Design a binder for this molecule. Structure first.
Ligand SMILES: Nc1ncnc2c1ncn2[C@@H]1O[C@H](COP(=O)(O)O)[C@@H](O)[C@H]1O
Length: 631
DNA sequence: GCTGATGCGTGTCGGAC
DNA sequence: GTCCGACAACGCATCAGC
């Protein structure tokens, strides 16, 4: 019986402990029961084993449901490049919860805010049982609804789900819709569970499967080593082809050992990009890299563009998160013939697209880039031009370069591609181990409109193998260095969600405007404090809660705090940059008549226990800092 | 026809292991 | 170090209300 389904039990048997009949649809309650057992524990290894048990039963009994169960576990709707999104947030969701439970919407909103979780409100307040594929399909139905009256149609589907929910299902339906499943298990653990499941219980056997536990005859050491090896086969393939729609049919038909024979890196199919680990100083860079020669490059402030040229000439462009951006950049597309030597027949390039001012011939801020339209059919209508800064080459003329060292990938990039100023340029770079030269290069990068340096080894562990290490590169920014900040007043707090439930998750901060003697909201703040500090803030600020705002506190367009606070606490906050804000009033009129100023990537540093609000950073100082950054 | 509100999509940080 | 999920500013696109 699905109500008693226990994928965390000892001696889990994929056949005998499943809670549905062979070949029938996996019930959604089996998924919900699995989620309960996963969120109850903190050790990822234990979460992986529990999910693996569900997956082995899916493989053994009902293999067509493997793909929807995996998406439900990731809370994804499909492969990233297809771009389906629910179009559902707390607004649509709580209205649906309110109507399903028959309660007033304010009562539902208030309880969800206090509890920090929509799932508990949806649950604790005729139709056939939900199935995993049925729920997944309805989720995709919600995402495809568009046009006038689509909100009411989305709500109707959601109410239909809640009406059919049993036991714990409503909790997880609502958390999924809210984007906050909170399992503690995400992409890497799902892949580990999948490789473990298909290794222990191979797909494609006639029911009942003759092989239920392929690890039974191995010592514990041989079992661990084997599962690690199978797990790396799945992880390397997925990093090249992060698309379960392609992988799972192949896995089900040919098994995991033969997977790389059928799914490999190829132009037109986005791959996982290499990411960067933040490093807090040049000395820390030499420590992570030890003896290995490395290169430093400008870290451009734009958007990543993974540019694919297929054999035959089709070009596709993907984002860092593998969204299809091809329709966004008809200007890039028309430029491709200019950037390659005539011998290049296909490639995958790793680049940064940066807004570029063709009148002044210079880079423009990230903010300017974000004003491009999402779709543009005529390059003629484009107003924000872009320059591509190329820094890697992943595939060339039919061959993957993923196992080549950066020294060779970079040489192939420079040898086979053609620069045009203001259109396509190789990232500015420096090969050195001299601490003083690196420090000056870091300074120069900021003067040249970049946010810092990327650092990459050239020959030691210098490949593009994301499954081996996804953060193989280092990012170095001046704002990571100690002593290289603003003192702001806490004027409000926001109730925490999830891991912050039951305390404050965020705070509203303000600068002191000397001329009006008012406090002006400047940004929110929600990271940089330890768990212990955040509880201390909850305890000390609760004494300062007020029913109504003070008349000298101005927040204009900011989110109204859940709790207004008597202005008293002053905190030191660090940011990457200041920005001209559409909503915050701080220093409005000092630089821009209509816009005040906010903080890019603010983080809490420490309490200024001995600073009164009137001695906080002033709005005039905020303006001065913004002007200094703006040349 | 306009607009404000909602949703999606483009970093820093600490905890458990 | 890895994995995960708290939380930031601010843009476009969309849609309900007007
Ligand atoms: N020279 C460069 N090499 C690699 N990434 C770069 C470079 N310049 C800018 N970037 C961007 O920096 C991001 C890496 O930082 P992060 O996303 O913080 O891991 C990439 O996704 C790129 O969009």
């Amino acid at each position: 019986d699905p109500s008693g389904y226990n994928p965390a039990k000892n001696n889990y048997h994929p056949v005998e402990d499943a809670c549905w009949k062979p070949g029938q649809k996996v019930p959604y309650l089996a998924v919900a029961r699995t989620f309960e057992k996963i969120e109850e524990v903190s050790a990822r290894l234990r979460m992986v084993e529990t999910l693996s048990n569900l997956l082995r039963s899916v493989v053994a009994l009902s293999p067509p449901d493997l793909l929807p169960v995996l998406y439900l576990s990731l809370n994804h709707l499909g492969p990233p490049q297809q771009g389906l999104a629910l179009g559902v947030g707390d607004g649509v969701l709580l209205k649906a919860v309110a109507q399903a439970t028959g309660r007033q919407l304010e009562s539902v909103r208030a309880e969800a805010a206090e509890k920090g979780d929509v799932g508990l409100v949806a649950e604790n307040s005729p139709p056939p049982p939900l199935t995993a594929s049925g729920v997944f399909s309805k989720f995709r139905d919600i995402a495809r609804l568009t046009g006038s009256a689509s909100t009411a149609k989305k709500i109707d589907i959601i109410k239909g789900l809640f009406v059919a929910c049993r036991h714990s299902e409503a909790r997880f339906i609502a958390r999924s819709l809210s984007g906050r499943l909170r399992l503690g298990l995400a992409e890497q653990s799902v892949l580990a569970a999948l490789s473990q499941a298909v290794s222990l219980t191979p797909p494609g056997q006639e029911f009942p499967p003759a092989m239920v536990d392929a690890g039974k005859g191995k010592t514990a050491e041989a079992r661990k080593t084997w599962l690690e090896e199978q797990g790396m086969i799945l992880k390397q393939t997925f990093c090249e082809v992060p698309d379960l729609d392609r992988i799972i049919p192949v896995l089900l038909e040919h098994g995991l050992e033969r997977l790389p024979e059928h799914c490999k890196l190829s132009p037109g199919i986005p791959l996982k990009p290499m990411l960067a680990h933040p490093t807090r100083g040049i000395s820390e860079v030499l420590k992570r890299f030890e003896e290995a020669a490395f290169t430093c490059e400008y870290k451009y402030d734009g958007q990543r563009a993974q540019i694919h040229a297929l054999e035959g000439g089709e070009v596709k462009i993907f984002s860092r998160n593998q969204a299809d951006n091809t329709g966004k950049y008809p200007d890039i597309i028309s430029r491709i013939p200019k950037i390659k030597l005539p011998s290049v027949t296909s490639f995958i390039l790793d680049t940064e697209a940066v807004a570029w001012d063709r009148e002044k011939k210079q880079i423009q801020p990230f903010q300017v880039l974000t004003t491009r339209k999402r779709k543009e059919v005529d390059a003629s209508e484009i107003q924000v031009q872009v320059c591509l800064y190329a820094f890697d080459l992943i595939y060339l003329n039919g061959e993957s370069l993923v196992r080549e060292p950066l020294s060779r990938r970079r040489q192939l990039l420079r040898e086979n591609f053609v620069e045009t100023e203001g259109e396509f340029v190789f990232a500015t770079s420096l090969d050195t181990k001299d601490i003083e030269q690196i420090a000056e290069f870091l300074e120069q990068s900021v003067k040249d409109s970049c946010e810092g340096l990327m650092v990459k080894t050239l020959d030691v562990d210098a490949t593009y193998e994301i499954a081996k290490r996804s953060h193989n590169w280092l990012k170095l920014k001046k704002d990571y260095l100690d002593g290289v900040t603003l003192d702001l007043v806490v004027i409000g707090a926001y109730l925490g969600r999830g891991k912050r439930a039951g305390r404050y998750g965020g705070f509203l901060l303000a600068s002191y405007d000397e001329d009006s003697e008012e406090l002006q909201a400047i940004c929110k703040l929600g990271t940089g404090f330890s768990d212990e500090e955040l509880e201390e803030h909850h305890q000390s600020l609760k004494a300062l809660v007020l029913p109504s705002p003070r008349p000298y506190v101005r927040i204009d367009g900011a989110v109204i705090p859940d709790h207004w606070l008597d202005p008293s606490a002053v905190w030191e906050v660090k940011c990457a940059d200041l920005s001209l804000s559409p909503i915050y009033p701080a220093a409005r009129g000092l630089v821009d008549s209509d816009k005040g100023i906010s903080l890019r990537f603010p983080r809490f540093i420490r309490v200024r226990e001995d600073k009164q609000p009137e001695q906080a950073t002033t709005s005039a100082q905020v303006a001065c800092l913004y002007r200094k950054q703006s040349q």
